[PDB]
Amino acid sequence: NYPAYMDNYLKEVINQVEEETGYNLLTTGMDVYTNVDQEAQKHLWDIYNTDEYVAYPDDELQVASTIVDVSNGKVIAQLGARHQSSNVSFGINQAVETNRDWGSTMKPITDYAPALEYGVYDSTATIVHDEPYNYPGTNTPVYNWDRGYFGNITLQYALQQSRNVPAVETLNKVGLNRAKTFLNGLGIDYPSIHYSNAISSNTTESDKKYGASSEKMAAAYAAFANGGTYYKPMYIHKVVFSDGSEKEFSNVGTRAMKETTAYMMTDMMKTVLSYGTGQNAYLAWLPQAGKTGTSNYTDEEIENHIKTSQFVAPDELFAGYTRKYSMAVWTGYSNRLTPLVGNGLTVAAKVYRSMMTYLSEGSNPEDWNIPEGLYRNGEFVFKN
């Protein structure tokens, strides 16, 4: 027996124990010590399943999210579903599932960070281009959400307004192979990468590690938070075996980007919340950064299954981090063909706001310190 709110977390623990030990804890007696902050995890459950924190449009709208400790990659909370009146033990955990499109949340990690890392751009003020534009080697246009084009704009403003053209063009300038390598360093892979991946986590396999889940995004963004080191999501701290043996898991990280890249990304993503698309997550007292995401339906889907001229989306996504924690939030419906509408598109950011409030309140929320190699200027940050 075990509490219901822990069902998702335990399922990953079970999977992670046998990955490292080769032993399934359900068939072998062992005491397993985990990274789950029980109080935080309960609060996540409170947010999903009550009225106290978030105004949901209906009871079938789904939320999946993972919260990570930015210093070690310990997953401290995870809930893959809300309102589940079907108690089969250790079911599909949507929080580690990579089969929903993470849309614009791919931009910082696939496009803009690599461009800064490999020195394609030199500052957050670099004039980038929002003009009519085709996917390289194709006649298909990269449309913006409004079908409009802003023209000559700063990098910062591009990311902040979440424009598509500058993102895709940036992926072309970094190069597909170079970008794939960058994503790998952040725990994300594709079997094959394509230019549509500048604005989509859409993939062919997703049998295993391919694409993006709240789990992988939490881990990926955590790198921005800590000056650019990636940690593997860890659910288990220590196992003690029936025969008295004990195995402790130390969490070691890998340099995923230069500290200047991290800082510059953070500095731009601060504005997403203040001046941009992320304004439902804004908190005056909390130094935090983040990126929003709204995936879209296909050509086949708009024609045949989706009937409306209202703004709709199968998936709404937020990915934010403070100095201490990283959180990726996915929202949507089980059936992708049930579209998010009006207030439903604000859930993802409001779930983030509520959880982050809880976790950061009471500490001294530290801001980020401008590192050696960068200097301030007006609204923007420049290299040396």
Binding site: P3, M6, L10, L26, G29, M30, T34, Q38
Partner: peptide
């Protein structure tokens, strides 16, 4: 057969 699971504060949370 008998596996115990503890949170980050070492207090039992599941017995499987």
């Amino acid at each position: 057969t008998s596996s115990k699971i503890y949170d980050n504060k070492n207090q039992l949370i599941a017995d499987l």
